[PDB]
Each structure stands twice: as structure tokens, then as C-alpha cells.
């Protein structure tokens, strides 16, 4: 499901090497490591982004995001 | 063949860690993970692209991108 | 605890491959090798950031850290 | 030998996953996977490369090259 | 000790691997394959570097660098 669509708020890069990122009020997390500088360049440019999860309560992991 | 040739209208990080765009209208993919990045900066700063591929149909995969 | 929170002034590649950064007056390093790419962004672009560790005097490690 | 100078014309990722450049006229290769983000970058910028090999005829390989 | 500090004038991707920075007129170089990227973005910024090593005259290897 689309899980949240919007800006991200802020990005962080957490102790056990996850990256989570604050989307229309909701945080999701992900241990994809490719996505970290790919979701930090999106919040630089202040560009939409899609969390895409089965789950999508707030503090729910993710691995797929569209860009735009 | 060039099967498509324009700017990125989306990106999207996919759940197999394959990398899709939308160019001209039509989507493909790629698992080169060398290309993720290079599409990403691509889409972020509007280079035209020229999506290389046997086929061209939306949904194919490809592996040759060329950046304008 | 938020240790610092503010523009990185310096970063600084050290000689065991750790990297260091000056935030609101004291320095903080980390060994977290994919920290080195989001840093240097987030000083590039005037990027607020906030170092969150347990050990917050000048000269203290860290592996966590927001993005505003 | 300095085989040529001048702006990066296009770019092209290839198959094989070697990286392509068009730099006055010629065409070069490189089997170095970083520098493909180094040469994308230039490209992005309009930086002039040098491209340094043994055998400069158009379609010969590199694995040097300076950025102005 | 401060070899050098100021603009980086050029860089220079090598054969072997190794990466090169021409700073204050001197020529300094690399084996850190984690520095290219930064190195390559301080020049492409404009940012001051400030090359650090016990060995300062032209044609010497670091492995230590202040970004500001
Ligand atoms: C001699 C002719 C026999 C049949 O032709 C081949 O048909 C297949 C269709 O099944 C074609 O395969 C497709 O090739 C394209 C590239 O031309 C894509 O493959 C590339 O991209 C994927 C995903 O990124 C992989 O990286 C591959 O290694 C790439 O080559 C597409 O996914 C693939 O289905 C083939 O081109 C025809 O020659
Ligand atoms: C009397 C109470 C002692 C027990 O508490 C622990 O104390 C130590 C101090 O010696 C704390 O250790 C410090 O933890 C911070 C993070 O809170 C830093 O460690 C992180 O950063 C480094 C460098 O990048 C490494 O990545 C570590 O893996 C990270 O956790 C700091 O460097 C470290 O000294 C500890 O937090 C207390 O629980
Ligand atoms: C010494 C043997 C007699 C002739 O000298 C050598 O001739 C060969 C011609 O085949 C030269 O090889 C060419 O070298 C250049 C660099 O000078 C290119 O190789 C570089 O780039 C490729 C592709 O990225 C690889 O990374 C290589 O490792 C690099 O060295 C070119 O592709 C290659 O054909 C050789 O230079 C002469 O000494
Ligand atoms: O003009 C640059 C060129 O770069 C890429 O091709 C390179 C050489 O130009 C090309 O001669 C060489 O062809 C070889 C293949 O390497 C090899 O895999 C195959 O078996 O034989 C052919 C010759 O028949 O390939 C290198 C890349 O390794 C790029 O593929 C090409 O489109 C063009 O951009
Ligand atoms: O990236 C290359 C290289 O950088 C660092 O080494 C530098 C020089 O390359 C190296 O020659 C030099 O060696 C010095 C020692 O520092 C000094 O203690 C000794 O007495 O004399 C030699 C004289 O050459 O060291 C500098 C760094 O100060 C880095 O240390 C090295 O690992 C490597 O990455
Ligand atoms: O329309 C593009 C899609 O690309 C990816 O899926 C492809 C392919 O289209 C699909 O049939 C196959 O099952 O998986 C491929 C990836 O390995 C994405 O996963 C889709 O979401 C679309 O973006
Ligand atoms: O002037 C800097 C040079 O850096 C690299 O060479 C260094 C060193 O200068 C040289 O003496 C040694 O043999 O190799 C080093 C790299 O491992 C480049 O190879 C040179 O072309 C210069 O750029």
C-alpha cells in the first residue's frame, strides 16, 4: 500500500545502521543502504517521495519508495 | 534499440532492490545496482536520457542508458 | 541526547578512516563509514543537523544523527 | 598520452557495465566503477576531463583521467 | 602537519587506483577510495581543503583532510 506521500520532514541515520525518514507525520524505517543517499538527496531537493509497505503504521520498516 | 528518450518523470526503489523510471511515458527497470544513482542525479537534475534496450515495451528491463 | 544541533562549521576525513565534525562549538567523530557522503551533503547545503549520542562533551564518538 | 580534453558530450552506461564518454569527438570506456559517478558528476557541471591512455584512437579503453 | 590549503585546482583519477588533488600548487595523493567522492565534491563546490600529512611537499601521499 501507499503508506504516506509527501515531503520528508527529516531524515536519521540510526545506531544500528537503519535509516528512517519522517513522511506526512508518520516515521518509517529502512535498512536498505542504497536508499540512504537516494532518500537524503530527495529531502535536499524537497522532492514527494511514496513509502511503499505492507505496513504503515508509524515506526514500520520499508524498502520500496517512488521518487516523484 | 532506443526505446525511450526524454527526462525522468518518476524513480522508484522497488522491494527486490531492482530500480525502475518513467521515461516518455513508459516505465523499465533495471537490477544494475551501478545505475541507481546515476538515474537518481539524473532525474534530480533533468539530463535526458535514452533507455536502451531489445524491448521496449512499457514494464522491460534494461541495461544500457545513455545520458545527455 | 542531542548533543549538538546546528550547521556542520568543519568536517574532517581522519587517518583511521573515522570523520569528524564541529557542530555548535565541539567536535564529534564517528567510524560509520556511510555517515561520510551525508555528512559532507548536509555541509554543503547549510543542512541542520543534530548529533545524538550518550557521550556529548567535545571530541566524543556518535553513530547517530538527524537530518532537518 | 592526454588522448582528449574538452567536455563530456553524453555519457552512456553499457551492458557489460562499463561507462562510456564522448570528450571532442572520441569515444572512451572505462572499466573503473568509480569513476562513473566522478564522470557524471563533471558532466553535470560541464567540467572539462582529460582522458589519459596508451591508446587514444576513438573506442579505446582509460583508467585515468583528470577533472580540470 | 597543514601541507596545504585552499581550493582544490584539479583531481586526478590514477591507474592504480589512487586519487590526486592539486592544492596550492602542489600535487598531493590518495589511497583512500572513501575520499574521492568527497574530494571530487569539494572541488566541484568551491570548498576550501585543508590537505594534512607529515609529508608536505609536492607529489606526497595523505590521508587526512579538512573540509570547510
Ligand atoms: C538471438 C535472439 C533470441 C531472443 O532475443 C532476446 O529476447 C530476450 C527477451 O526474453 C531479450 O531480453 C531482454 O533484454 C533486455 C536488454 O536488451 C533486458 O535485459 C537487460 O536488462 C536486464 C534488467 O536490467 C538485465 O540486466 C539483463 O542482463 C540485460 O541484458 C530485458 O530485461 C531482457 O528481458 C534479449 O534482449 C533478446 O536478445
Ligand atoms: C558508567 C556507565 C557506563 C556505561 O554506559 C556507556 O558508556 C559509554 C562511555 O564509555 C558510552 O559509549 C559511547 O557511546 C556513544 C553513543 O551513545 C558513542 O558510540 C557510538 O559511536 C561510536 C563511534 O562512531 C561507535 O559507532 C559506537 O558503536 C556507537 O555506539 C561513543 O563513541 C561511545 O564511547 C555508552 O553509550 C554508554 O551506554
Ligand atoms: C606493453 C605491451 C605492448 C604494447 O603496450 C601495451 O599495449 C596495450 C594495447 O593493447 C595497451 O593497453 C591499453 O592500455 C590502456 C591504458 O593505457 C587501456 O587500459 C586501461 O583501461 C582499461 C579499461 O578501463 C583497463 O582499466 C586497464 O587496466 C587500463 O590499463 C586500454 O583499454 C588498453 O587496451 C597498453 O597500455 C600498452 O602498454
Ligand atoms: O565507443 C565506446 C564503446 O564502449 C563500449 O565498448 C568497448 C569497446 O569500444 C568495444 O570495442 C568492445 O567490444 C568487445 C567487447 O568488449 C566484448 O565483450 C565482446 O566479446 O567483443 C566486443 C568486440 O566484438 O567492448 C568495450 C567494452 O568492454 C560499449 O559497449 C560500446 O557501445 C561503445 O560505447
Ligand atoms: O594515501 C597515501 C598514504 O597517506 C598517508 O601517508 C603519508 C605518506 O604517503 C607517507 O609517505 C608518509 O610517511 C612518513 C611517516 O608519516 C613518518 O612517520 C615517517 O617517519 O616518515 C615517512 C616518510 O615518508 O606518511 C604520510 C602521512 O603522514 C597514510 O599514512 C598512508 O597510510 C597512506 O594512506
Ligand atoms: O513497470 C515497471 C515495473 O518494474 C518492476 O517490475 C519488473 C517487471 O515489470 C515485473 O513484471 C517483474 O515481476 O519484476 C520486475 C522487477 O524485477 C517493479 O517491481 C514494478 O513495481 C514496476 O515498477
Ligand atoms: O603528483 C602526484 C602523483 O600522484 C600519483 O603518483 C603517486 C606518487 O606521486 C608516485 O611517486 C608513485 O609512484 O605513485 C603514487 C600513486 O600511487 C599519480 O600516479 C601521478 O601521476 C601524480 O598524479
Given at each position: 500500500?501507499?503508506?504516506?506521500?509527501?515531503?520528508?520532514?527529516?531524515?536519521?541515520?540510526?545506531?544500528?545502521?537503519?535509516?528512517?525518514?519522517?513522511?506526512?507525520?508518520?516515521?518509517?524505517?529502512?535498512?536498505?543502504?542504497?536508499?540512504?543517499?537516494?532518500?537524503?538527496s530527495a529531502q535536499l531537493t524537497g522532492m514527494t517521495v511514496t513509502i511503499i509497505?505492507?505496513?504503515?503504521?508509524?515506526?514500520?520498516?520499508?524498502?520500496?519508495?517512488?521518487?516523484?
Amino acid at each position: 500500500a501507499d503508506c504516506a506521500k509527501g515531503k520528508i520532514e527529516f531524515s536519521k541515520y540510526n545506531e544500528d545502521n537503519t535509516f528512517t525518514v519522517k513522511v506526512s507525520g508518520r516515521e518509517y524505517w529502512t535498512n536498505r543502504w542504497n536508499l540512504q543517499p537516494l532518500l537524503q538527496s530527495a529531502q535536499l531537493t524537497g522532492m514527494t517521495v511514496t513509502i511503499i509497505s505492507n505496513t504503515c503504521s508509524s515506526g514500520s520498516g520499508f524498502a520500496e519508495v517512488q521518487f516523484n
